[PDB]
């Protein structure tokens, strides 16, 4: 049924693997709510010659932020968390900040879309200001290779609380991870329980059993190794790192199946609202339809790094549908997030299917494609390959 | 036929054994009423270099409660026992109890689901009260290492009969073992025959030949040895213990085939009703379907320790199947009981198969999977391994 | 080289095994200081079908007295122990005992040959008196089945310290085991260290690398089971017992090679004195010849139970050499000790070779035969079989 | 040819592995200069299910001292090193030290046999002094979990240079690893080349191609993982550590074939002296016989921790050949060194064969047994197992 798109997808995977040089890569493609392809090429452990399998466990670096949003959404739906109020209500430990001698409010909504003025692994404000001015017209950092073990989010707040702001909140978009550490602290304070157990409950609800936080001591089966090329153009192991300070922003281990399930749940929650009118035998989504349409609504004055046409909206990169000129390029609406860490690259992409008159009456949610790719290599851009694979699978729907 | 599934299961057995440090482990799997795999890994007797075999005899700790429950169900079907009436009807030797100076009644139905006020190896009321209060928001005990031999069931009642109750009956779930000793006294009084003799007949009916109570003087072939780790992390023998005071609670020795037979009989008795209508050539089950449905009917205000999703139902752990949201986790119905004795651990799991229109018309009972695992290592959790093995075998049904 | 004697002794082994139905038996025969035969017939573990082998470990009951005697003799040679001083000098915990209102003295020498008034598993002052009078003219005791664990010897002395003397010390022979507990306490006092670690050093000196004390907790490889026959004439297991209160008297584990080595050392120490003048390159024995000749010197008014011809001589049974009439029975000089415990029986026998003027000049010690037999059946007499095997192997000396 | 020996050796290995619950174990045996058995039992990588093979690379902790002794002996034979002069000739950075205000000399010979006053992972002088005084009548220390990287030995000396001595040099034995760090510094100074380059030259000369220093970045094929048991008696991973500060003392990775080759070279160097008269076509040893006899000569007032009978002799444990009494224990001459690291244990043993006049003319060196055992479990003593395996292989010599 899908014997043609599989070969093209494998060819594209070989293309990207050969161009980059990654020792291993794993892909998972799910169509219409069911997993239809899982593949792994290369070695998960070069030293011991362990081949890549669909149950290989790797690092999802920036995709974790998306998961955080879900938790926040749940805390929003119960009404326990309000986006408008300043963040000092929940966490007094965060000092009151001032910009150019005036009071400026820092809110949860600003943190979610990276509209505050928190820094991102950089301290020289002049370089950041010059970069932003040039734009208007990162692996060399030392904080990336921290080794200290932090007990909780409060202990990790000390890394950036004393630094001054870089821009007036709500005015300039600056991608940063410490804002999501603050978000995790807010989640801990508002929920009343620890962040890790809340995330574990969410994982249990969504049926993502393999997902877990990265730690050295526990024994985690099928854990992959991470590699990088050195100055002499030779493969070597990345330095040992500890990610206990950025749980919500950069630390989580998972396979492709869990990401496929997460994408399918998001797609069903998004699309069930339209089908609800036709039939009443459909189960409710995980989140309310208003929350789901709030997540994927682009926020103005934002940039999305991995494709120029997109905009950033609630830990997601959303590309809308438009055709400004006749017989010209027709943009396809989709939502993707890309993650990169020390010796690890990943992409999660959701391509919803456009709905017609008969589709809403006859078909059943979900209707779309989810593509997840993970490789144990550093500084690899996987968005375009995922988009091409999704389009290839979408071409021959039936 | 079942090559891949068997290989996967073997790896899972190795993984649990390696992490725990268990010297030996035995597994048995039954599919649709026939035995498809039995295996043993390691040594049953470390000192004499005796390997583990599918016919190794080991301890079962809390699975004896299932057999006592089967005896009680047979007596109830025969009409000689009433669940509602107070236990003073059968055993007057149990003193009348008075909680907070008010009259309370102790009934068999309460003892069955651990909802009475009987203690469990703990004699300080304040510790239990504070633990239960915290819960609202045992291998160190001396009674577990008794050596005195008890001739009959009435003698063993003096351990706990004089002690007061801990909670009001029917309000708090307190997992206890002495309740089943009192149940054994009830069975002995009502049936007119000794508990061991009646249980021998019940075992004979089910073809459970190797099952027998644990005693020192008789010669029992293929008996395994039980071990534990000391403060220096070196394997050692457990102390000599006399389990005669809890015959109905934890004093039986059995192989994996006997547990497979018991599980298959339970599954057939559960499932015969649906197939009875289509085909009239089927033999009656060991118990009536009205008793079998009550057997696996979860009770409110009860907790299943080995899985947070299930509840307690007539000396069993039951996990009902439900799906709250679309594209989200769906539970699968199964019944499991786990036991942990001094030096041994065991698990028995029954996974019934959902039935469709085609299956009912043509196929015959029983339809399901029964998995039994035993290891001679103390404090080992095995329920998850059994569930994973059962799910692995389920996929390659045809 | 010994083909005839091997078969002729295997015949006697089968005879003695069939006569009592012992499940297993092990024999070791050494001639001229070299182990020439080691055999095992039957099953060491009936339940798990473990065949007997020469490295099987079984209980030795009264040979522990012969082992403690080496420690006592070594302490005496070191000058730290005095045989004639009252034992109250070493152990004041023992009270001053009085016989019929007259002062009496208890010494080490009286305790060596059971000439004191210490009782033995019998608490009736009268019951033993008529038995002793009839003689002049104990498996049913509960003391043999004690389960308490004793940490040090002084605690273990509490079982008999308050009881009065049965006879005037030094006048009546009464085989007792508590006297050797008192001797172990005396060794504790004089040596200044523990009893068990002193015997460990002695065993290490003699190359007996598998002679350890019997405890349940440690893992002991190749350990064997012990059986008995009940009133219905069926094979059953002996009850679990603890021998911690009679380490020096009735509790140790060993193989047959250890007993062979111990006997070889004793024989060499007994015989090197004569060969000393012939050759000066002979190493000294573990004990001086003056101590060895006193070791095997019979004591008046002492009875050797397992052979009516001999007498008791410093924890050994010795039969001398004599010929009263011409062409009549000619006694042979030999030393043997027999041990019987709960579920096991054993014998060790040393038969020295008569030497002429030629052999002393031409031969090198040791010159004799050592035979050790152990069977796991309660209350079996084994002295006669050992003596007959020793004579058969003496027949084919070279 | 060695089937019985192989079977018996396999069983012993099984017993130790079961006792300590080691995930994996590798053994290598060389008989008379040839390798006859190389076996692996268990898993090298528990997480990824990688079985142990002879070509597994594990940690050697204390054998690196035995490897550094070869470099020191080679330098001594070259005439570029003096054992008597104080070390400050080569390393002025090490300060002159005072014990109770009297001049003391720190020489190479004292540090070779751990006779100086240098400490070992312990800073409290009072505790060490009390322990030594008690004896007259290390995996919990923080320094063992260092993560800092040291470029060269000169800066690595800063950890202990300012700490005064604990005992007067040449008077008390104190096992330490920092003394060999100073020895590595002395080797760097006197050789005129870097320590690691000289060690690589030696490894190339001895055909030990797989022996390399432990570095995280380089890709080392067949590298294993190292495990421990936590408080909950569950298998976990050891923390990340760095051993760059004790290159010569505790950091090196090697297989079992390399250790067998090293032992063969040492044995040939030790035994080539006797056979030189019988045949003149034998190649010279790696070291002069006068060097080898000095190396394996026990030093007075030194204690061998893993064997009470032997004594420490120039980075080795040597047991003397002696027999005090007749028909008693006869000691056997052998050299053994045991190394324990964080999550790894290893042992290397050499057993020479006693030679007579008729053996020299016909046989050729080497004549002995070399046994190497490596396991990835923390704090395992493998000396006795290696000795038993060596003796079992010695019984079936021809």
- C283/D325 Cβ within 8 A: yes
Interface size, chain A vs chain D, as Cβ–Cβ contacts under 8 Å: 54
Provide the domain limits for residue A379: 1-398
- Measured CA to CA in angstroms, residue C155 lies from C121, D40, D77 at distances of 18, 49, 63
Residue C14 Cα, gap to closest chain D Cα (Å): 29
How many CA atoms within 13 Å lie on the side-chain side of B367?
17
- Technique of determination: cryo-EM
Selecting among C9, C62, C66, C372, the annotated active-site residue is: C62
Phi-psi sector, C392: left (phi>0), alpha (psi -120 to 50), beta:
alpha
**Domains held by chain A: number:** 1
Comparing alpha-carbon positions, the chain A residue that sits nearest to B329 is A207
Chains C and D touch each other (3 or more Cβ pairs < 8 A):
yes
* Strand ranges (E), chain A: 24-31, 34-45, 50-51, 58-59, 227-229, 235-237, 253-254, 311-312, 317-319, 334-341, 344-352, 368-375
How many CA atoms within 13 Å lie on the side-chain side of C10?
12
CB D368 within 8 A of CB D351: yes
Closest Cβ opposite residue D47 in set A220, A237, A240:
A220
Q: Which of B303, B264, B274 is nearest to B113 (CA)?
A: B303
Reported as type and span, the H/E element at residue D253 is strand D253-254
Cβ neighbours of A53 in D, within 8 Å: none
The tokens of D85 are what? Answer: 């002069």
> How far apart (Å, rounded) are the C-alpha atoms in residues A55 and A37?
13
CB A21 within 8 A of CB A377: yes
> Could you please report the per-residue DSSP string of B301-334?
S---TT-TT-EE-SSSEEE-----STTS-----E
Phi-psi sector, B114: left (phi>0), alpha (psi -120 to 50), beta:
left
Closest Cβ opposite residue B219 in set C50, C216, C236:
C236
CB D121 within 8 A of CB D143: yes
How much is the CA Rg of chain A, to the nearest whole Å?
A: 21
> How far apart (Å, rounded) are the C-alpha atoms in residues B138 and D247?
47
Residue B264 Cα, gap to closest chain D Cα (Å): 34
Instruction: Answer yes or no: C346 catalytic.
Output: no
Closest Cβ opposite residue A219 in set B19, B323, B324:
B19
- B325/A286 Cβ within 8 A: yes
> How far apart (Å, rounded) are the C-alpha atoms in residues C210 and C55?
9
> How far apart (Å, rounded) are the C-alpha atoms in residues C54 and C44?
11
Q: Which of A270, A339, A334 is nearest to A66 (CA)?
A: A339
Cβ neighbours of D19 in C, within 8 Å: 219
Q: Which of A29, A28, A59 is nearest to A44 (CA)?
A: A59
> How far apart (Å, rounded) are the C-alpha atoms in residues C263 and C259?
6
Residues forming beta bridges with residue D345, ordered by sequence position: D340, D375
The tokens of A263 are what? Answer: 């994408």
Residue A225 Cα, gap to closest chain D Cα (Å): 11
Residue D229 Cα, gap to closest chain B Cα (Å): 8
Closest Cβ opposite residue D328 in set C206, C221, C365:
C206
Comparing alpha-carbon positions, the chain B residue that sits nearest to C48 is B222
Residue A365 Cα, gap to closest chain B Cα (Å): 9
- B43/D19 Cβ within 8 A: no
Closest Cβ opposite residue B327 in set A33, A219, A221:
A33
Chains A and C touch each other (3 or more Cβ pairs < 8 A):
no
Which chains does B contact via 3+ CB–CB distances below 8 A?
A, C, D
CB atoms within 10 A of CB C82: 15
- Measured CA to CA in angstroms, residue D122 lies from D64, D144, D245 at distances of 21, 11, 16
- D23/B18 Cβ within 8 A: yes
Q: What share of chain B is helix, strand, coil (3-state, %, to 5)?
A: 35, 20, 45
Looking at chain D, the number of H-run helices and the number of E-run strands are 12, 14
> How far apart (Å, rounded) are the C-alpha atoms in residues A360 and A32?
14
Cβ neighbours of B326 in A, within 8 Å: 268, 272, 282-285, 365-366
**Residue burial B366-384, b: 16+ Cβ < 10 Å; e: rest:** bbbbbbbbbbbbbebebbe
> How far apart (Å, rounded) are the C-alpha atoms in residues C141 and C119?
13
> How far apart (Å, rounded) are the C-alpha atoms in residues D130 and D133?
5
- D21/B21 Cβ within 8 A: yes
Q: Which residue has the tokens 């240098």?
A: D118
Closest Cβ opposite residue B216 in set C218, C222, C239:
C239
Chains D and A touch each other (3 or more Cβ pairs < 8 A):
yes
> How far apart (Å, rounded) are the C-alpha atoms in residues A238 and A257?
26
Residues in chain D: 398
- Local structure of C43: helix, strand or coil: strand
Selecting among B30, B62, B66, B254, the annotated active-site residue is: B62
The tokens of D145 are what? Answer: 């979990």
Residue B10 Cα, gap to closest chain D Cα (Å): 12
Q: Which of C170, C156, C182 is nearest to C117 (CA)?
A: C170
> How far apart (Å, rounded) are the C-alpha atoms in residues D94 and A85?
63
Residues forming beta bridges with residue B40, ordered by sequence position: B26
Comparing alpha-carbon positions, the chain C residue that sits nearest to B237 is C217
> How far apart (Å, rounded) are the C-alpha atoms in residues D10 and D21?
16
- A46/D45 Cβ within 8 A: no
Which chains does C contact via 3+ CB–CB distances below 8 A?
B, D
DSSP C111: H
CA A227 to chain centre: 22
Q: What share of chain C is helix, strand, coil (3-state, %, to 5)?
A: 35, 20, 45
Q: What share of chain A is helix, strand, coil (3-state, %, to 5)?
A: 35, 15, 50
Residue B342 Cα, gap to closest chain C Cα (Å): 14
**β-pair type (D102-103, D98-99):** antiparallel
Q: Which of D378, D366, D129, D66 is nearest to D239 (CA)?
A: D378
Residue B327 Cα, gap to closest chain A Cα (Å): 5
**Start-to-end CA span in chain A (Å):** 8
| Close Cβ partners of C127 (under 8 Å, ≥ 6 residues apart) | none
Cβ neighbours of B216 in C, within 8 Å: 237, 239-240
> How far apart (Å, rounded) are the C-alpha atoms in residues B310 and B166?
25
- B235/C217 Cβ within 8 A: no
- Measured CA to CA in angstroms, residue A200 lies from A194, A213, A254, B170, B331 at distances of 10, 10, 13, 33, 17
- D223/A216 Cβ within 8 A: no
The tokens of C1 are what? Answer: 């080289």
CB atoms within 10 A of CB D161: 14
Which chains does A contact via 3+ CB–CB distances below 8 A?
B, D
Closest Cβ opposite residue C205 in set D15, D326, D329:
D329
> How far apart (Å, rounded) are the C-alpha atoms in residues B257 and B347?
13
Question: What is the strand order of the sheet C311-312 is part of?
Answer: C50-51, C34-45, C24-31, C368-375, C344-352, C334-341, C317-319, C311-312
> How far apart (Å, rounded) are the C-alpha atoms in residues A151 and A103?
32
Q: Looking only at Cα atoms, what is the longest distance across chain B? A: 65
- D46/B21 Cβ within 8 A: no
- D237/A47 Cβ within 8 A: no
CB A391 within 8 A of CB A284: no
CB B42 within 8 A of CB B205: no
Comparing alpha-carbon positions, the chain B residue that sits nearest to D48 is B15
Q: Which residue has the tokens 């909950």?
A: D232
CB B235 within 8 A of CB B229: yes
Q: Which residue has the tokens 């009679």?
A: C246
> How far apart (Å, rounded) are the C-alpha atoms in residues D242 and D345?
17
- B20/D234 Cβ within 8 A: yes
Reported as type and span, the H/E element at residue C344 is strand C344-352
Interface size, chain A vs chain B, as Cβ–Cβ contacts under 8 Å: 40
* Strand ranges (E), D20-67: 24-31, 34-45, 50-51, 58-59
CA-CA-CA-CA torsion sign (C70, C74, C75, C81): positive
DSSP A145: G
> How far apart (Å, rounded) are the C-alpha atoms in residues D46 and D58?
14
CA angle C188, C189, C193 (to 5 degrees): 50
* Strand ranges (E), B86-234: 98-99, 102-103, 212-213, 227-229
CB D375 within 8 A of CB D386: no
**Residues of chain D with a CB closer than 8 angstroms to some CB in chain A:** 44-48, 50, 147, 216-223, 230, 235-237, 239-240
Residues in chain B: 398
Residues in chain C: 398
Comparing alpha-carbon positions, the chain D residue that sits nearest to B47 is D15
CB D309 within 8 A of CB D323: no
Cβ neighbours of A222 in B, within 8 Å: none
Cβ neighbours of D50 in A, within 8 Å: 48, 50
- B50/C222 Cβ within 8 A: no
> Could you please report the per-residue DSSP string of C172-219?
S----SHHHHHHHHHHHHHHSS-HHHHHHHHHHHTT-TT-B---SSS-
> How far apart (Å, rounded) are the C-alpha atoms in residues B41 and B57?
14
The tokens of C232 are what? Answer: 């219905």
The tokens of A218 are what? Answer: 């526990």
**Start-to-end CA span in chain D (Å):** 8
Closest Cβ opposite residue D328 in set C219, C267, C286:
C286
Helices (H), A207-255: 247-250
Cβ neighbours of B240 in C, within 8 Å: 216, 240
Selecting among D62, D191, D336, D345, the annotated active-site residue is: D62
């Amino acid at each position: 049924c899908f014997a043609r798109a599989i070969e093209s997808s494998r060819d594209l995977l070989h293309r990207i693997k050969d161009e980059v040089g990654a020792p291993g890569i794993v892909v998972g493609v799910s169509v219409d709510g069911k997993e239809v392809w899982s593949e792994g090429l290369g070695y998960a452990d070069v030293e011991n010659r362990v081949p890549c399998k669909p149950e290989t466990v790797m690092r999802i670096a920036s995709i974790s932020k998306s998961l955080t949003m879900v938790a926040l959404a749940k805390l929003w739906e119960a009404g326990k968390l309000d986006l408008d109020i300043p963040v000092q209500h929940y966490v007094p430990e965060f000092p009151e900040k001032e910009y150019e001698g005036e009071k400026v409010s820092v809110t949860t909504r600003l943190l979610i879309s990276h509209l505050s003025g928190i820094r991102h692994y950089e301290k020289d404000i002049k370089k950041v200001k010059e970069e932003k001015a040039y734009k208007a017209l990162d692996f060399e950092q030392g904080e990336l290779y921290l080794r200290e073990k932090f007990e909780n989010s409060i202990e990790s707040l000390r890394l950036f609380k004393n630094d001054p702001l870089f821009f007036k909140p709500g005015s300039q978009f600056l991608y940063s991870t410490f804002g999501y550490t603050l978000l995790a602290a807010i989640v801990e304070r508002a929920s009343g329980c620890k962040y890790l157990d809340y995330m574990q409950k969410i994982f249990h609800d969504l049926d993502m059993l393999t997902t877990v936080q990265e730690e050295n001591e526990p024994v985690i089966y099928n854990r992959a190794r991470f590699y990088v090329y050195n100055k002499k153009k030779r493969l070597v192991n990345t330095p040992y790192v500890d990610n206990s300070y950025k749980w919500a922003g950069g630390g989580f281990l998972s396979t492709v199946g869990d990401l496929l399930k997460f994408g399918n749940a998001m797609l069903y929650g998004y699309q069930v609202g339209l089908f609800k009118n036709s039939n009443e035998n459909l189960l409710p989504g995980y989140l309310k339809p208003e929350t789901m349409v709030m997540m994927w609504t682009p926020v103005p004055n934002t940039e999305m790094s991995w494709d120029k046409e997109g905009k950033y909206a609630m830990a997601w990169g959303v590309v809308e549908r438009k055709q400004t000129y006749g017989s010209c390029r027709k943009q396809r609406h989709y939502a993707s997030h890309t993650g990169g860490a020390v010796g690890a690259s990943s992409v999660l992409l959701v391509l919803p299917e456009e709905l017609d008159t008969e589709t809403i009456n006859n078909k059943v949610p979900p209707r779309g494609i989810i593509v997840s790719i993970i490789c144990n290599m550093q500084s690899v851009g996987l968005n375009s390959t995922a988009l091409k694979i999704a389009l290839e699978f979408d071409k021959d729907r039936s």
